[PDB]
Enzyme design. Structure first.
Site, PDB file in Angstrom:
ATOM      1  N   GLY A 257       9.234  -3.062   6.866  1.00 54.43           N
ATOM      2  CA  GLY A 257       8.862  -1.704   7.228  1.00 54.43           C
ATOM      3  C   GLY A 257       8.699  -0.878   5.972  1.00 54.43           C
TER       4      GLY A 257
ATOM      5  CG  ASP B 118      -1.485   0.405   7.892  1.00 55.66           C
ATOM      6  OD1 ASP B 118      -2.218   1.285   8.381  1.00 55.66           O
ATOM      7  OD2 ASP B 118      -0.293   0.612   7.684  1.00 55.66           O
TER       8      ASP B 118
ATOM      9  N   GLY C 295       3.554  -1.346   4.238  1.00 57.42           N
ATOM     10  CA  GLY C 295       2.547  -2.158   4.915  1.00 57.42           C
ATOM     11  C   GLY C 295       2.609  -3.663   4.713  1.00 57.42           C
TER      12      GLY C 295
ATOM     13  CE  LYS D 132       0.846   1.068   4.529  1.00 62.24           C
ATOM     14  NZ  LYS D 132       1.456   2.316   5.093  1.00 62.24           N
TER      15      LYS D 132
ATOM     16  CB  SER E  38      -0.046  -6.657   2.828  1.00 66.16           C
ATOM     17  OG  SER E  38      -0.705  -7.170   1.667  1.00 66.16           O
TER      18      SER E  38
HETATM   19  N1  LIG Z   1       5.741 -11.627   7.574  1.00 72.96           N
HETATM   20  C1  LIG Z   1       6.188 -10.408   7.966  1.00 72.96           C
HETATM   21  N2  LIG Z   1       6.533  -9.474   7.053  1.00 72.96           N
HETATM   22  C2  LIG Z   1       6.986  -8.253   7.405  1.00 72.96           C
HETATM   23  N3  LIG Z   1       7.131  -7.855   8.683  1.00 72.96           N
HETATM   24  C3  LIG Z   1       6.821  -8.685   9.706  1.00 72.96           C
HETATM   25  C4  LIG Z   1       6.324 -10.040   9.399  1.00 72.96           C
HETATM   26  N4  LIG Z   1       6.108 -10.639  10.581  1.00 72.96           N
HETATM   27  C5  LIG Z   1       6.430  -9.752  11.562  1.00 72.96           C
HETATM   28  N5  LIG Z   1       6.863  -8.587  11.036  1.00 72.96           N
HETATM   29  C6  LIG Z   1       7.287  -7.392  11.812  1.00 72.96           C
HETATM   30  O1  LIG Z   1       6.608  -6.227  11.314  1.00 72.96           O
HETATM   31  C7  LIG Z   1       7.512  -5.112  11.223  1.00 72.96           C
HETATM   32  C8  LIG Z   1       7.706  -4.613   9.788  1.00 72.96           C
HETATM   33  O2  LIG Z   1       6.521  -4.000   9.275  1.00 72.96           O
HETATM   34  P1  LIG Z   1       6.164  -4.034   7.696  1.00 72.96           P
HETATM   35  O3  LIG Z   1       6.984  -5.119   7.037  1.00 72.96           O
HETATM   36  O4  LIG Z   1       6.192  -2.641   7.109  1.00 72.96           O
HETATM   37  O5  LIG Z   1       4.611  -4.444   7.716  1.00 72.96           O
HETATM   38  P2  LIG Z   1       3.598  -3.650   8.690  1.00 72.96           P
HETATM   39  O6  LIG Z   1       4.308  -2.344   8.999  1.00 72.96           O
HETATM   40  O7  LIG Z   1       2.330  -3.468   7.886  1.00 72.96           O
HETATM   41  O8  LIG Z   1       3.452  -4.589   9.873  1.00 72.96           O
HETATM   42  C9  LIG Z   1       8.843  -5.587  11.779  1.00 72.96           C
HETATM   43  O9  LIG Z   1       8.989  -5.149  13.133  1.00 72.96           O
HETATM   44  C10 LIG Z   1       8.779  -7.097  11.710  1.00 72.96           C
HETATM   45  O10 LIG Z   1       9.536  -7.687  12.772  1.00 72.96           O
END
Ligand SMILES: Nc1ncnc2c1ncn2[C@@H]1O[C@H](COP(=O)(O)OP(=O)(O)O)[C@@H](O)[C@H]1O
Ligand SMILES: Nc1ncnc2c1ncn2[C@@H]1O[C@H](COP(=O)(O)OP(=O)(O)O)[C@@H](O)[C@H]1O
Lengths: 282, 283
Positions: free
Chosen positions: B101, B141, B105, B10, B109
């Site tokens: 990060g 999100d 998102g 996103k 997702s």
């Molecule tokens: N399958 C996954 N993919 C990405 N991030 C993950 C996952 N499982 C846990 N996390 C945690 O989410 C955070 C990263 O966020 P991000 O990848 O941007 O997705 P979102 O911010 O929507 O959770 C990190 O702290 C990471 O440790």
């Protein structure tokens, strides 16, 4: 004309931290009960569209006050769906007895009471669901106060199931220290992995507050108050502190211990009630 | 049998911080659109009740993975409301293309796609409302991804109104810096007083992200990427960073700018889509 509206305190009878999302928000499983003790909010309607808080609350400016924030949010939300009669306004005064902070939820209570009261007096006709939704944007605990019943809260604080825990008497002590909620929630030793469990499970388990170990360790004043009270009764932290409550079956026993308490407990006694004093006076 | 399930990125086309509660949580008004680009999650059903993630995600433990957290939360929620067939389980593998990060998102997702996919495959029959509720406990999100349409989000991230913003093409750049969301949200100079406005107002205003000024100033790699991109097109932070996106009417123009870009932009090009690739595959 003038109307009066209770804004009771709450205690978290239990508080379990189940997880923390990537944005930093903590999910919780927690049990709320009201106190038959709190603030009183007086309202006088206006027909010129103005909102006035006539009683300053120590250390919060007018427009940051949850009372004003709640009234303006209600006004704006109603108006945007044509639910706000022209001229809708109010003079608002609070007889403020609840400490600032403490984990008694005074701010959230104030906002809940204002939304419910003004929704009713302005005849905006919003549902309790709608008021609870809106209220959650103002304070974590506003939905329990808006809905009006002792309740098990989960989700992100929006999922509330009524329960009827024991309506005990409490000696509520306020240790002489300020604990902003973020201070506890940022702590690296905070538990953040308590297993999600059923209300059936939790209700039969020993009640505890996951924040307590932290608040006790970081703040000597909480440790002092907790140590003093545990000599007399089961006593726990409410919210993220600083307040601590000791449970008793009767008013006489609670007040027996109060009369023995040192001044530095800054204690009072109040009865747990499962139907909110707000809603009761309704 | 093995099914594949999109887990798209996103962008926050705008993000306004309207307030902060006593507990520290910030309320937002933000507009989401998907990218036709992201992760792919493959699922094989099990009949022994196990949940396995076969593909580890960099730096994330099995049980801390949002894929596993989401699968286990659904299973528990279905079982307790009598909506999980006996033996329901799954092997789950992720082809992970999204940064960790970055403000795209990816984690949210992945969790949304797992919930949606397993709800369908195990035949639990939970509503979108229930799946969005559950999901919001895992990631800020998740609801937009579960409900599957470009959307204006307010409340505490549960109140979603469908919107159809322009399906532009984006050059998405990833400055070479890690920004944990809490670092932006705890900053004293972050705006937290943007007036809560109507969707109609917002859609016809200049789009901006209230987190950008902080991210730019604290992490000058972000400032570098933004400055470079702003010479070619309107450009903004997504989420709380570090990713920045530049908008273009066509793929050709976006890839033209990508071609000129320095290596330190770490950029790709993707099209914005208002129907999620997850929901499109399920049509
Ligand atoms: N399958 C996954 N993919 C990405 N991030 C993950 C996952 N499982 C846990 N996390 C945690 O989410 C955070 C990263 O966020 P991000 O990848 O941007 O997705 P979102 O911010 O929507 O959770 C990190 O702290 C990471 O440790
Ligand atoms: N009417 C109000 N009563 C209490 N706090 C208020 C009020 N208006 C604004 N605030 C601010 O918000 C915070 C709320 O704290 P607290 O009184 O414990 O309420 P709650 O815990 O329900 O949010 C306080 O730190 C205070 O500065």
């Amino acid at each position: 004309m003038r109307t009066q509206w209770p804004s009771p305190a709450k205690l978290n009878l239990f508080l379990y931290i189940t997880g923390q999302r990537a944005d930093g928000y903590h999910t919780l499983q927690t049990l709320f009960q009201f106190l038959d003790y709190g603030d009183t909010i007086s309202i006088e309607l206006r027909d010129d569209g103005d909102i006035r808080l006539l009683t300053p609350v120590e250390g919060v400016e007018h427009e940051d006050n949850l009372i004003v924030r709640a009234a303006r949010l209600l006004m704006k939300t109603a108006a945007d769906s044509g639910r706000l009669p022209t001229g809708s306004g109010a003079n608002i005064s609070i007889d403020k007895r609840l400490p600032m902070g403490g984990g008694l939820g005074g701010g959230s209570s104030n906002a809940a009471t204002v939304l419910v009261a003004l929704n009713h007096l302005w005849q905006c006709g919003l549902s309790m669901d709608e008021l609870a939704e809106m209220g959650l944007t103002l304070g974590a605990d506003v939905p329990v106060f808006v809905r009006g019943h002792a309740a098990f809260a989960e989700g992100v604080g929006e999922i509330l199931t009524p329960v009827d825990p024991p309506e005990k008497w409490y000696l509520v002590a306020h240790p002489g220290v300020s604990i902003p909620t973020p201070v506890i929630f940022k702590d690296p030793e905070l538990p953040r992995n308590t297993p999600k469990r059923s209300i059936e499970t939790l209700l039969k388990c020993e009640f505890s507050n996951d924040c307590e170990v932290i608040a006790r360790k970081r703040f000597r004043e909480v440790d002092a108050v907790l140590s003093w009270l545990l000599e007399y009764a089961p006593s726990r932290l409410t919210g993220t502190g600083a307040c601590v409550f000791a449970e008793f079956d009767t008013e006489s026993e609670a007040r027996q211990v109060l009369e023995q308490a040192p001044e530095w407990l800054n204690g009072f006694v109040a009865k747990g009630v499962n139907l909110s004093p707000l809603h009761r006076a309704m």
